[PDB]
Amino acid sequence: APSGAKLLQILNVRVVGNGDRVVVLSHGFGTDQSAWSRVLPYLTRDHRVVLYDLVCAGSVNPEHFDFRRYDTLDSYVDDLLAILDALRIPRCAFVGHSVSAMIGILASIRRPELFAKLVLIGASPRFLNDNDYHGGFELPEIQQVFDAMAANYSAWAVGYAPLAVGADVPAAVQEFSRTLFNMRPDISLHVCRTVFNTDLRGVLGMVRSPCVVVQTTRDVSVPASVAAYLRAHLGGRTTVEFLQTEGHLPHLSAPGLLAQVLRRALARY
């Protein structure tokens, strides 16, 4: 597996901004680090911002996608820590969307002194239901996503993109579809399978970093009740912030409102 040093190029690592307060921005499924481009200038005057692409992003050469290594989220965590260690960053705030919120939770447990604060957007510890637990999906319907992605990825993408964006923002729909279509279909399916096989409920109590959970009014993959569950079970001091906007991708569809929350969350850590 590639070293942290090699990952700096493979994952298109970028470091921008001023100061010694470090913020890492980690994008979610179906995008790449360009998803942060609209909120980024709200952070770079006050923070040193580290950006990178998950190995599944369309902007990463498909040759580096190890279908063995990456069938667990633990390997995505390995990559994040390797990048931060290569950059010689001992302490940071971490902002993760979607799968990266799960990666952030796992990274905080692996390296408690490295993560001074987590900000989780579109966050869920488990997407499948379980008795007294509402995740949003039953097993036969995650299986329906899989069959649709495999049978007709392009048609699945055009249907999913407006649902994910949620609000009526056509430039966000087109920009998300573009990065969804840049992904190779088999890699896209593989990451989705990995995310739906992840269940972090049993380790939330092991997180000790303070956390801010960012909740929008409506999220196709995250039920409103999930944020309360995270606040109840995360092992650190946790606050829920409410974006009065609709959708799963507020960094695409409502950058100004999102930036207000991020600046508040990242003021002291």
Author numbering: 0 to 268
Show me the paper's own sentences about this structure.
Here, two putative SL receptors SsD14a/b and the interacting F-box protein SsMAX2 were identified in Saccharum spontaneum. The crystal structure of SsD14aΔN was determined at a resolution of 1.65 Å. SsD14a belongs to the α/β hydrolase superfamily, of which the structure consists of an α/β hydrolase core domain and a four-helix lid domain (αT1, αT2, αT3, and αT4). The catalytic triad residues of S145, D266, and H295, distributed on the loops following the β4, β6, and β7 strands, are located at the bottom of the hydrophobic substrate-binding pocket. The rest of the core domain is made up of seven β strands (β1–β7) and six α helices (α1, α2, α3, α8, α9, and α10). R310 is located at the α10 helix of SsD14a. Structure comparisons revealed that the overall structure of SsD14a was identical to those from other plants in the open state, with root-mean-square deviations (RMSD) ranging from 0.250 to 0.301 Å. Notably, the overall structure of SsD14a in the open state was apparently larger than the closed state of AtD14-CLIM (covalently linked intermediate molecule, a hydrolysis intermediate of SL molecule), thus these two structures cannot be well aligned, with an RMSD of 0.662 Å. Furthermore, results of docking approaches demonstrated extensive binding of GR24 by residues in the catalytic pocket of SsD14a. Mutagenesis analyses revealed that residue R310 at α10 helix of SsD14a was crucial for the binding with SsSMXL7/AtSMXL7 but not SsMAX2.
Strigolactones (SLs) are a class of important plant hormones mainly regulating plant architecture such as branching, which is crucial for crop yield. Different from other receptors, which could only sense hormone molecules, the receptor D14 have dual roles to sense and hydrolyze SL, demonstrating a brand-new function mode. During the hydrolysis of SL, D14 covalently binds to the D-ring at the catalytic center, then it associates with downstream protein MAX2/D3 to form D14–MAX2/D3 SCF E3 complex. This ubiquitin ligase complex will recruit the downstream transcription repressors SMXL6/7/8/D53, leading to the degradation of SMXLs/D53 through the 26S proteasome pathway.
